[PDB]
Amino acid sequence: ADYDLKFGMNAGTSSNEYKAAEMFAKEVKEKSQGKIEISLYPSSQLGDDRAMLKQLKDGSLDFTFAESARFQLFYPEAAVFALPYVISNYNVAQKALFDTEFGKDLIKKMDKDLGVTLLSQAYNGTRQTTSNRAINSIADMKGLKLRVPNAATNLAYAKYVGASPTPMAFSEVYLALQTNAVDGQENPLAAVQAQKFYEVQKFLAMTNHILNDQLYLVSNETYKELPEDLQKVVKDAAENAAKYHTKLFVDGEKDLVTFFEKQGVKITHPDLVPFKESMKPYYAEFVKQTGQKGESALKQIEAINPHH
């Protein structure tokens, strides 16, 4: 009521992201004694993630989600977070961001250059590929009309495996799939469930190509105005919500394959060696474009042990 704040997201009301944001909103309201109320704006009501990041910068939106990789729009080396097959697991994603020089620098720059404060990081699933025909091997990708988000790294995944990428906003995907304007898409299993893409896709291939994190971000214009006791409430609530957010994704990844099979989806397990070898020229291109900053980030990440 004193602070009527807004949290925008691309995800919808059935999603894990929305569930975690609800938990965050409820904890902030309770622990602030009602001084802060957070309203949720799902389903790209305020724009996509690129638009909502701009709104955080300007101070017209208070909170939003982004992947670490999405900062490639400003810092090309940050694409390293979404180079296909580079980041093996969430353990690596966490250490890449918080425990490398490159990641620490990125967090500083988001605050200083972009006016956003990183509150917490969660896991947001590993992307897989759905389609209207079976993907039994890399050969089946050739010429497949694959929807991707408006992001360079996803476009590259599609191009380098031989598909024909079609960029479009998340909100447009169900209808594109329903009408077969595209042949498939790619997203974590949880998003396939939340958006009901299983109603309009018969096949799911475990391509395991890009791992997504999720950052809880606040606008500096809003965070700086909170008394420090309320800043702590927001920070602590974001870290609690991120743990819950991660749990939701980890649990679903165990169970969701079975759910899809019961819904009539056929699951394939193509040999991933040719998918990985197909990305080698893209890694080369990334280093050529981003120079020593990129080569260095890639080496810092490749050094991380994936085992807990």
Ligand X SMILES: CC(=O)N[C@H]1[C@H]([C@H](O)[C@H](O)CO)O[C@](O)(C(=O)O)C[C@@H]1O
Residues at the interface with ligand X (CB under 6 A): 10-11, 49, 65-67, 69-70, 149, 151, 170, 187, 191, 212
Residues 117-136 that bind Cs ion (CB under 5 A): 132
CA distance 308 to 136: 32
Cα maximum dimension of the chain: 58
CB of 307 to ligand X, least distance (A): 26
CB of 288 to ligand X, least distance (A): 22
**Where does 114-262 show beta strands of DSSP type E?**
116-131, 145-148, 164-167, 184-188, 203-205, 211-219
49 assigned to a ligand binding site: yes
> Which residue, 226 or 260, is less far from ligand X as judged by CB?
260
147 assigned to a ligand binding site: yes
The two structure tokens encoding residue 12: 């919808």
Interaction partner, residue 264 (Cl ion, Cs ion, ligand X, none; CB < 5-8 Å by kind): Cl ion
Is 274 one of the binding residues for Cl ion (CB under 5 A)? no
136 assigned to a ligand binding site: no
> Which residue, 69 or 93, is less far from ligand X as judged by CB?
69
> Which residue, 231 or 300, is less far from Cs ion as judged by CB?
231
127 assigned to a ligand binding site: yes
> Which residue, 137 or 168, is less far from ligand X as judged by CB?
168
Is 133 one of the binding residues for Cl ion (CB under 5 A)? no
Is 200 one of the binding residues for Cs ion (CB under 5 A)? yes
Contact, 132 vs 144, CB < 8 A? no
The two structure tokens encoding residue 207: 């391509």
Nearest to 28 by CA among 221, 218, 247: 218
Do β-strands 203-205 and 116-131 pair in parallel, antiparallel, or remain unpaired? antiparallel
Contact, 201 vs 265, CB < 8 A? yes
CB of 254 to ligand X, least distance (A): 21
C-beta neighbour count of 307 within 10 angstroms: 7
Do β-strands 184-188 and 116-131 pair in parallel, antiparallel, or remain unpaired? antiparallel
The two structure tokens encoding residue 49: 């993630």
> Which residue, 94 or 132, is less far from Cs ion as judged by CB?
132
> Which residue, 184 or 294, is less far from ligand X as judged by CB?
184
Strand partners, 4: 37
Q: Strand, coil or helix: what is 285? A: helix
CB of 70 to ligand X, least distance (A): 4
Q: Count residues near Cl ion (CB under 5 A).
A: 2
Residues that bind Cl ion (CB under 5 A): 142, 264
Binding residues for N-acetyl-beta-neuraminate: 10, 49, 67, 127, 147, 187
